Amino acid sequence: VNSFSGYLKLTDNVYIKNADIVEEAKKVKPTVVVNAANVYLKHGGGVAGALNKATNNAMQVESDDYIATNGPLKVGGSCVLSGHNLAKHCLHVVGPNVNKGEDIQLLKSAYENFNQHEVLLAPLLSAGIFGADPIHSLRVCVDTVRTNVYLAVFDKNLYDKLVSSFL
Ligand SMILES: Nc1ncc(S(=O)(=O)N2CC(F)(F)C[C@H]2C(=O)O)cn1
Numbered sequence: 103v104n105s106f107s108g109y110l111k112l113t114d115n116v117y118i119k120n121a122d123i124v125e126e127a128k129k130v131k132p133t134v135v136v137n138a139a140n141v142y143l144k145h146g147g148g149v150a151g152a153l154n155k156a157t158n159n160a161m162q163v164e165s166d167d168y169i170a171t172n173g174p175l176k177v178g179g180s181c182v183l184s185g186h187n188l189a190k191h192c193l194h195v196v197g198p199n200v201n202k203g204e205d206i207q208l209l210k211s212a213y214e215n216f217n218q219h220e221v222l223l224a225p226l227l228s229a230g231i232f233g234a235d236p237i238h239s240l241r242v243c244v245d246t247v248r249t250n251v252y253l254a255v256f257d258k259n260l261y262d263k264l265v266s267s268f269l
């Protein structure tokens with residue numbers, strides 16, 4: 103038993119809710135919140151900008167030190183950093199950005215990072231400003247992640263579509 107509420111169960115291990123991941127994070131304090139990161143951990147907009155703002159820019163300060171030490175992430179890769187006031191940990195995951203021409207097949211590699219964590223609160227990778235089809239992203243999530251994932255979908259219209267079209 104865990105503290106997530108109002109989720110619709112999609113599969114054995116995937117759940118989904120129309121929610122603002124920032125607000126869901128501040129209420130659940132999950133062990134892991136997933137960020138929709140870029141390779142530079144520049145949290146300017148989308149999910150990342152919103153999560154960083156909720157940390158009063160502490161996420162960005164920590165991220166800049168991470169990059170200065172380690173260099174950029176790979177597309178499809180991830181790193182674990184602090185969750186600040188939102189979660190114990192933040193898993194920063196880089197899905198391919200269609201608006202940068204990156205290969206969509208890397209979306210499966212991105213979701214594989216979730217399997218290193220038993221339970222996660224996460225957005226749909228490569229959705230939103232990353233330019234992928236969220237229905238495709240949901241399909242890859244369901245077919246790749248084996249751990250328990252609680253997906254927060256900000257847009258109510260999209261949430262309903264995702265539900266109504268789910269196979
Ligand atoms: N607060 C906040 N801001 C942005 C995002 S998103 O852009 O990553 N995301 C992914 C999506 F589902 F495909 C569309 C969008 C959403 O959930 O409506 C998430 N949460």
